[PDB]
RNA sequence: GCUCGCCGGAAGACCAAGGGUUCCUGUCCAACGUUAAUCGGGGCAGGGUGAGUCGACCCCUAAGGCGAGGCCGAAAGGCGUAGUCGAUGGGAAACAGGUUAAUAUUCCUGUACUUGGUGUUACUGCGAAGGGGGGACGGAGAAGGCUAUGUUGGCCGGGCGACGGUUGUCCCGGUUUAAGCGUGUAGGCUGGUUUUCCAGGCAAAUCCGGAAAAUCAAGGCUGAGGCGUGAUGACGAGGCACUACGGUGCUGAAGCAACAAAUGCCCUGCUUCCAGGAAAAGCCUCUAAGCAUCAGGUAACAUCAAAUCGUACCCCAAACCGACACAGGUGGUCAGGUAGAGAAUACCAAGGCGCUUGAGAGAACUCGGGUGAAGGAACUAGGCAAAAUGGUGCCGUAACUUCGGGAGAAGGCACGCUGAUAUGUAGGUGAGGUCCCUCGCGGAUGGAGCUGAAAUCAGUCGAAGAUACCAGCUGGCUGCAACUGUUUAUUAAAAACACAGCACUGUGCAAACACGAAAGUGGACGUAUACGGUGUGACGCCUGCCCGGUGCCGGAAGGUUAAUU
RNA sequence: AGGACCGAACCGACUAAUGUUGAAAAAUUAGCGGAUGACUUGUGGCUGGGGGUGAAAGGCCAAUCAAACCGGGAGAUAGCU
């Protein structure tokens, strides 16, 4: 049966990537929280 | 025209392998490790200057580095650039 | 002409078609075309604002001349054409100077007929004049509401206005609704009725024919649950409330016009 | 290695997406692999991806996003103009053969093509952010011409058979060749050519559009395939020589014709319909400012350049999405033979596999199947399940009907093989020859060869000839819903929802209405034959009485009544 | 011509049996419906939580829905176990 995760790297990047995060105040707050927590990977970008 | 300082950095090493050995004997082609950012024009210039040969054409490719376990920790070797440099017929490097 | 389809399948049995052999079979005049992509009834917030709009055939927009302000230059009708964007047909006209335009096709207009606009045009169908220069009692269409703005009234297939009176700067019009309205006498109108009056005899015949025209299905309020609509609810067919819109306003008689700015121009409401 | 079995519109082959070394080689077997394992998509090491023409990048836009100023908003921000991004679409150009353990339209061999920069020569009105053309567009249908491809004959090479026969109307194999260049064919579309004038194309225009004359009868554009050339080449059944028996070295005959034939190509065509079918650039063309013997444009020649990134491998799967080496899911491309209407079905080809626990035994019971005396729904809530029907042609077919239907109603007959009609028919195709020719990829006649149904007569075998696989059970009365559709992803598919149709009602355009503190946007580039809401639900015959209650509409005298004073 | 007819691909899900610590957190096998259309499918886009979207089942909105998920108010409150 068709499951929920149907991967597309273009959609991944556009939805959750570094530039999408940076485009809004709320996205920049995500990055701030993740930096503060000390995450090795800030975003899905790769 | 490329500066000699640039040309002295672009060629890194000769590449040794059976494919490289056959390339030399059959097609008069040397195989080189080159700087990642080296262009075909820079490779041609550097080979002609530093090895004192006449170059017909340069083909290039990027080799992606292998992922490898050292003990338990995962590591990844660096990518590098390889050049197939075809020499003119009677050059004999 | 109005033709009844033979019942060779249940979806054809009730179809009635309006077939006009005068209409151009070929493609439209390409210099007067533009794209018009569809909305689904969704505004710039992305939300549905008008229900029941979606799909249907793709359509090119034909630029129709509602202003008719190229005065003093005769034009000849080249052909009548189908326009998907409206009920009326349109007519491609060629002005003597070499310009082509589309206009609304009046009743009676055919290829080869001559038309003209301006103060000194003849009182003939398809000619456009200021309503100061049009006799009282005349039937007109494509009537301007403000001088120079272009026709806004009586554009649909088979429609027309009557000039019932002239009083100084204004004429009184009887509209198709039955409303009596004042309009400035400087406003232009085109003589005659809009053509294609058989449009209203068509019978779509089947559900899919409304889908081709980009209408999606209406679900009745009473078929819904209370959270969805005031009429929603009930064990079986129940109602027991005053009919309302989905947003709770009475929908059987309650008047909704509220425009004190334009009230002065309305001589008599449609009633 | 020899047998056997399975797929073969896939269980073969090639991609995209997604993964990311799983690819190839050597080595190891602890763990991983539902067992063992010398094996592995496992561990360890080493190798492997070659591009002017493929793809991305690049140029161009769609939906949509972001948006200088702007408009709007307690703040955050919202919307949007100029713009700028955004492919799933438009935009230059390469083919065949060879080669590695692992890449190849990328390497080599052979033969091509494209764009741009320079420079030479000859001619020359060049120039855009502007104008025009083009690009540039739907569904369905029909037929013709072709090709891919296949079958047969010929030809060449090989064979003479483990058991009766097999020098022949015998058996096996091969019989391949591109882009480009030339030719402009079947066919499609369009009347040309020249002058004069002009309220049009934001200004100009020699361009487009319009008007008017003269003149000519063919002028132009598009176009599959064929043929020539590419190609005295390559490839080649096989044969010969080595072998480090893994695979190399040497040499190579024939290489044609007919017939059949696509869902591919001509075809973005042609016919027809209504629901009326992107944009922008590249491309062609006209001029403005301006340059004005300069720059710049056109043609021929030479030369240089064409970067960068991807290219391994899996890809209906043990490599992707499903915690698994998981009976699930996953877009595109290719499409051999016999039989068949067929991409169904059976059996095979090329190619690929036997599904990573086995060995015995032959109890009950369970699962999936086969057959069954006599009876034949007696079973059961219920013929649930099973059994049955099942093709083609012809004959024949009721109530009722909205005249279409009902209808495949029901029911019945024929059906194999051989011979004859006719040593292979009707039909299809059409060589040679002959005649003409506004002369060629031409027209007429001609019929060789090839292909080939269907029918009738006669015979003949079997229990059975639509023999297998494949493939309607039928009829009668009745409730509900007109109908095709839609629905509770994962216990409800229905009488529920929708529907065409009907009615009431609101709405005069800065429309009602909806989204939004607003600006705005949808409604609609629509305008009462239009748009919104509500109910009813094809069609036929109809749709009675009540305005007291609750609502809505109209009224404006009087009573009562807010802020305010 | 056709929301025409028979029937594969393709889309669906009417019946039954199996399975129910499954091969599978919804399938398999044999039958079944649509199959030129209100059809089906690839890529990209838009609509957001009292909100969307809904041919309307309170359906669907990442194995979650009569108010999603994540963090926070937060050690909510619990005459109850
Ligand atoms: Mg090269
Ligand atoms: Mg419309
Ligand atoms: Mg309705
Ligand atoms: Mg309900
Ligand atoms: Mg309510
Ligand atoms: Mg009741
Ligand atoms: Mg009651
Ligand atoms: Mg088989
Ligand atoms: Mg099959
Ligand atoms: Mg590894
Ligand atoms: Mg391997
Ligand atoms: Mg062991
Ligand atoms: Mg083991
Ligand atoms: Mg390994
Ligand atoms: Mg490359
Ligand atoms: Mg934009
Ligand atoms: Mg700003
Ligand atoms: Mg914006
Ligand atoms: Mg762009
Ligand atoms: Mg693309
Ligand atoms: Mg390979
Ligand atoms: Mg052929
Ligand atoms: Mg087809
Ligand atoms: Mg590959
Ligand atoms: Mg397994
Ligand atoms: Mg699997
Ligand atoms: Mg047994
Ligand atoms: Mg049994
Ligand atoms: Mg049986
Ligand atoms: Mg029995
Ligand atoms: Mg018996
Ligand atoms: Mg009986
Ligand atoms: Mg009984
Ligand atoms: Mg009983
Ligand atoms: Mg049954
Ligand atoms: Mg059965
Ligand atoms: Mg009853
Ligand atoms: Mg029904
Ligand atoms: Mg469904
Ligand atoms: Mg269900
Ligand atoms: Mg508006
Ligand atoms: Mg109803
Ligand atoms: Mg049908
Ligand atoms: Mg049916
Ligand atoms: Mg599928
Ligand atoms: Mg069900
Ligand atoms: Mg099934
Ligand atoms: Mg069917
Ligand atoms: Mg309920
Ligand atoms: Mg869910
Ligand atoms: Mg709540
Ligand atoms: Mg608290
Ligand atoms: Mg607590």
Curated annotation (Swiss-Prot), chain A:
The keyword Endoplasmic reticulum does not apply. The gene is rpmH. It comes from Escherichia coli (strain K12). The keyword Transport does not apply. NCBIfam families: rpmH_bact. GO terms for biological process: cytoplasmic translation. Part of the 50S ribosomal subunit. This is Large ribosomal subunit protein bL34. Belongs to the bacterial ribosomal protein bL34 family. One of its GO terms (molecular function) is structural constituent of ribosome. HAMAP family: Ribosomal_bL34. GO terms for cellular component: cytoplasm; cytosolic large ribosomal subunit. Disulfide bonds: none annotated. It comes from the Bacteria. InterPro entries: Ribosomal_bL34 (IPR000271), Ribosomal_bL34_CS (IPR020939). PANTHER family: LARGE RIBOSOMAL SUBUNIT PROTEIN BL34M, MITOCHONDRIAL RIBOSOMAL PROTEIN 34 FAMILY MEMBER.
UniProtKB/Swiss-Prot annotation, chain B:
It comes from the Bacteria. SUPFAM superfamilies: Ribosomal proteins S24e, L23 and L15e (SSF54189). GO terms for biological process: cytoplasmic translation; ribosomal large subunit assembly. One of its GO terms (cellular component) is cytoplasm. Changing residue 52 to K: No effect on trigger factor binding. InterPro entries: Nucleotide-bd_a/b_plait_sf, Ribosomal_uL23-like, Ribosomal_uL23/eL15/eS24_sf, Ribosomal_uL23_CS. GO terms for molecular function: rRNA binding; structural constituent of ribosome. Keywords: Ribonucleoprotein, Ribosomal protein, RNA-binding, rRNA-binding. Part of the 50S ribosomal subunit. Contacts protein L29 and trigger factor. Might also contact SecE and probably does contact SecG and SecY when the SecYEG translocation complex is docked with the ribosome. One of the early assembly proteins, it binds 23S rRNA; is essential for growth. One of the proteins that surround the polypeptide exit tunnel on the outside of the subunit. Acts as the docking site for trigger factor for Ffh binding to the ribosome (SRP54) and to nascent polypeptide chains. Belongs to the universal ribosomal protein uL23 family. NCBIfam families: PRK05738.1-1, PRK05738.1-3, PRK05738.2-4. This is Large ribosomal subunit protein uL23.
Curated annotation (Swiss-Prot), chain C:
PROSITE patterns: RIBOSOMAL_L2. It holds the Pfam family Ribosomal_L2_C. GO terms for molecular function: RNA binding; rRNA binding; structural constituent of ribosome; transferase activity; zinc ion binding. Residues 38-47 have a biased composition (Low complexity). One of the primary rRNA binding proteins. Located near the base of the L1 stalk, it is probably also mobile. Required for association of the 30S and 50S subunits to form the 70S ribosome, for tRNA binding and peptide bond formation. It has been suggested to have peptidyltransferase activity; this is highly controversial. In the E.coli 70S ribosome in the initiation state it has been modeled to make several contacts with the 16S rRNA (forming bridge B7b, PubMed:12809609); these contacts are broken in the model with bound EF-G. This protein can be partially replaced in vivo by its H.marismortui (HmaL2) or human (L8, from the 60S cytoplasmic ribosome) homolog. This is Large ribosomal subunit protein uL2. It comes from Escherichia coli (strain K12).
């Amino acid at each position: 049966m068709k499951r929920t995760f149907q991967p597309s790297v273009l959609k991944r990047n556009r939805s959750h990537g570094f530039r999408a995060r940076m485009a809004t105040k709320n996205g920049r707050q995500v990055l701030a929280r993740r930096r503060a927590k000390g995450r090795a990977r800030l975003t899905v970008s790769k | 025209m490329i500066r000699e300082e640039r040309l002295l950095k672009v060629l890194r090493a000769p590449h040794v392998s059976e494919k490289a050995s056959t390339a030399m004997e059959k097609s008069n082609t040397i195989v080189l490790k080159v700087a990642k950012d080296a262009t075909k024009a820079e490779i041609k210039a550097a080979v002609q200057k530093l090895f004192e040969v006449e170059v017909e054409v340069v083909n290039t490719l990027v080799v992606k580095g292998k992922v490898k376990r050292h003990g338990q920790r995962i590591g990844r070797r660096s990518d590098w650039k390889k050049a197939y440099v075809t020499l003119k017929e009677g050059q004999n490097l | 002409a109005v033709v009844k389809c033979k019942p060779t399948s249940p979806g054809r049995r009730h179809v009635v078609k309006v077939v006009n052999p005068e209409l151009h079979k070929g493609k439209p005049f390409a210099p007067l075309l533009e794209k018009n992509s569809k909305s689904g009834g969704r505004n710039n917030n992305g939300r549905i604002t008008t229900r029941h709009i979606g799909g249907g055939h793709k359509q090119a927009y034909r630029i129709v001349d509602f202003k008719r302000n190229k005065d003093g230059i005769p034009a000849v009708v080249e052909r009548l054409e189908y326009d998907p964007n409206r009920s009326a047909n349109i007519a491609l006209v060629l002005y003597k100077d070499g310009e082509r335009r589309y206009i609304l096709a009046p009743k009676g207009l055919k290829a080869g007929d001559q038309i003209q606009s301006g103060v000194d045009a003849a009182i003939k169908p398809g000619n456009t004049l200021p309503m100061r220069n049009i006799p009282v009692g005349s039937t007109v269409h494509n009537v301007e509401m403000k001088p120079g703005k272009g026709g806004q009234l009586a554009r649909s297939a088979g429609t027309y206005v009557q000039i019932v009176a002239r009083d100084g700067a204004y004429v009184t019009l009887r509209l198709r609704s039955g409303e009596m309205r004042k309009v400035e006498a400087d406003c232009r109108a085109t003589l005659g009725e809009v053509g294609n009056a058989e449009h209203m005899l068509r019978v779509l015949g089947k559900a899919g024919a409304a889908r081709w025209r980009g209408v999606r299905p209406t679900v009745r309020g009473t078929a819904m649950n209370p959270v969805d609509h005031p009429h929603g609810g009930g064990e079986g067919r129940n109602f027991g409330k005053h009919p309302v819109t989905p947003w709770g306003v009475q929908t059987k008689g309650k008047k909704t016009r509220s425009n004190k700015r334009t009230d002065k121009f309305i001589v008599r409401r449609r009633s």
